[PDB]
Structures are given as structure tokens and as C-alpha cells.
């Protein structure tokens, strides 16, 4: 690669970087909260926890349902849940 050619790649990277800083500013402008990393992480941790504890709860309620010889849904009220949750 000649020096010339390398200068051309470096100037393209400069313009790529500028355009990305501009696109990022526009993307952040659409957010109520500009700390996007906090927003996304808080959501990921809540979804994690929710999927895990509902799974576990369904497992245990299913075992109680086995001992009582019934379908799991029949015990949902006793445990304070329903199937749209």
C-alpha cells in the first residue's frame, strides 16, 4: 500500500467516525433517558429474573398438582397467579 492509499483509508475512517457520531446523537435524541446502557441492562436483568422465577414457580405448582391429581391450572388461584401472567 502506498502512503497515498493509506491516507485515503484513514480519511474514509475519519468520515465513517463522523457519520457514526452524528447517527448516535440522533439515536440518543429519541430516548427519554440518554443513558441507553442503563435502560437496556435494567430491562435485561428484569426479563432474566421474571423468566426464571415464573419457570421455577410453574415447576413447583406442577409438583403440588401431581400430589393432588389435577391439572396445574386448578391450583393457580391458591397460589395467586393466572395463565396470562
Amino acid at each position: 500500500m502506498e502512503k497515498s492509499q493509506l491516507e485515503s483509508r484513514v480519511h474514509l475512517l475519519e468520515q465513517q467516525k463522523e457519520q457514526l457520531e452524528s447517527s448516535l446523537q440522533d439515536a440518543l435524541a429519541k430516548l427519554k433517558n440518554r443513558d441507553a446502557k442503563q435502560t437496556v441492562q435494567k430491562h435485561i436483568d428484569l426479563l432474566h429474573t421474571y423468566n426464571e422465577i415464573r419457570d421455577i414457580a410453574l415447576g413447583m405448582i406442577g409438583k403440588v398438582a401431581e400430589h393432588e391429581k389435577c391439572t396445574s391450572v386448578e391450583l393457580f388461584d391458591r397460589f395467586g397467579v393466572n395463565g396470562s401472567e
Binding site: 437496556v40 430491562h43 426479563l47 429474573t49 415464573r54 403440588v64 397460589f79
Partner: protein
Amino acid sequence: GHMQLLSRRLKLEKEVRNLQEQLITAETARKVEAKNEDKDLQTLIQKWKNAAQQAAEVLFKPMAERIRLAGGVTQSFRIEEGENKGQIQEVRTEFTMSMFLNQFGVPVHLMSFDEENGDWKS
């Protein structure tokens, strides 16, 4: 020379990757805000947590008693020193809620029993 240019290419390439990553994050945040479900998720977590705890207490109690009426729990390890080197060292102890929850694959941080105070943790 050209090493200043080479060094600047590498620095710009890193900055571009970092900005590309921030851009995705900012796009994801926009969708997370539009869904607006964090409150739903917190509410739902307490409901299902309350359910799992209640169900754990119903299942645990007679399980603990069945176990107890066949020796309880055996804890085992191998003896590594002394004239008994090789033998496995055994013991017996009661089945606890925490063994139960572990038996049910419940991460300690999700749901835990305060084995001393005899109730569930926040």
C-alpha cells in the same frame, strides 16, 4: 514516513467499533422504552416469587419428614490423611429448605430462605 498513519488507522478503527456498539445499544433502548414493561416485570416477579415460596413450603414440609424417616441426609467425603486414608467419612443431618431449593435448581440470588430466622429473604 507512514507509521503515524498506521497508528491512526488502528485508533480510528477502534473508535468506529465502539460507536457501532453504542448505536445498537441506543436502538435497543428505543425499543425497550416503547415496550415500557419494566413495571409489569417487577410486579410479575413478586407475584411469581410469592407463588414459588408458598409452593416450596407446601412441598418441602412432607418431603423433609419422608427423608427423616429413612436416615435423613448423608454428607460424604473421602479421608485424605492418617491411618484411615481412603475411607469415605459419612454423617447424617436434617433436610433443610436450602437443600430443597438447591434440589430444585433455584439460584441463591433469586429466592433464598433465611435458615436462622426461619423465613424467606427480600
